[PDB]
Amino acid sequence: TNPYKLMDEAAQKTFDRLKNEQPQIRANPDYLRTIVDQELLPYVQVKYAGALVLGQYYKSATPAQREAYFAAFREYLKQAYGQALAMYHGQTYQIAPEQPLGDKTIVPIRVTIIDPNGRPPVRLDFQWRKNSQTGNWQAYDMIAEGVSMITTKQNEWGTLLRTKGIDGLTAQLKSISQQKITLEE
Ligand SMILES: CCCCCCCCCCCCCCCC(=O)OC[C@H](COP(=O)(O)OCCN)OC(=O)CCCCCCCCCCCCCCC
């Protein structure tokens, strides 16, 4: 279980479904949520990325609040990444070539989304951590062009956390995950 292979398998499998399952996506755009759930989330440290988004506000949550938060957060990943896969129009991808890992516990792995018409590339640095029990590698952030998504969400949900706490943020996640995914034509 090595992050460069996993990064590449996740990518291969996602692109395959996006190319070959247009009928399913067009019959029901929320079917993108499946492609995210089956091809991308198995490699995502969903609790850890959820907890990082909470920061200070993790310590204060009851187990009940945390489990309701994480459930909401996974639904919210499927919806949000689903809505991003709605931007597919026959892009291809490139992976950073494998480095040796040595003793490193964090590794950034770039996937360049490549436009078929030679429009500008999108550089996504996926952040992989070695799990400290199992040794397995999982993604826990995405740096889109220069910017951490996790930091982007800390900043954007910070008032909602100061005003309404985890419960407020869990209500907003559930709310967004109920938005039907929309397709460009
Ligand atoms: C590896 C396979 C990659 C798939 C790419 C397929 C190509 C399809 C074409 C579309 C181009 C892709 C880039 C879209 C532009 C963009 O980055 O934005 C896509 C959007 C940002 O946009 P927004 O303003 O809607 O944010 C507002 C949306 N709420 O991020 C998101 O979902 C944000 C969600 C991130 C939440 C916290 C971060 C958790 C990190 C966990 C890591 C998960 C994946 C790990 C997998 C191993």
UniProtKB/Swiss-Prot annotation:
Keywords: Periplasm, Signal. GO terms for cellular component: outer membrane-bounded periplasmic space. Pfam families: MlaC (PF05494). GO terms for biological process: intermembrane phospholipid transfer; phospholipid transport. Disruption phenotype: Mutation leads to accumulation of phospholipid in the outer leaflet of the outer membrane and increased outer membrane permeability. It confers sensitivity to SDS-EDTA. Disulfide bonds: none annotated. It is found in: Periplasm. InterPro entries: MlaC/ttg2D (IPR008869), Tgt2/MlaC_sf (IPR042245). Involved in a phospholipid transport pathway that maintains lipid asymmetry in the outer membrane by retrograde trafficking of phospholipids from the outer membrane to the inner membrane. May transfer phospholipid across the periplasmic space and deliver it to the MlaFEDB complex at the inner membrane. Interacts with the MlaA-OmpF outer membrane complex and with the inner membrane ABC transporter complex MlaFEDB, via direct interaction with MlaD. Belongs to the MlaC/ttg2D family. This is Intermembrane phospholipid transport system binding protein MlaC. It comes from Escherichia coli (strain K12).
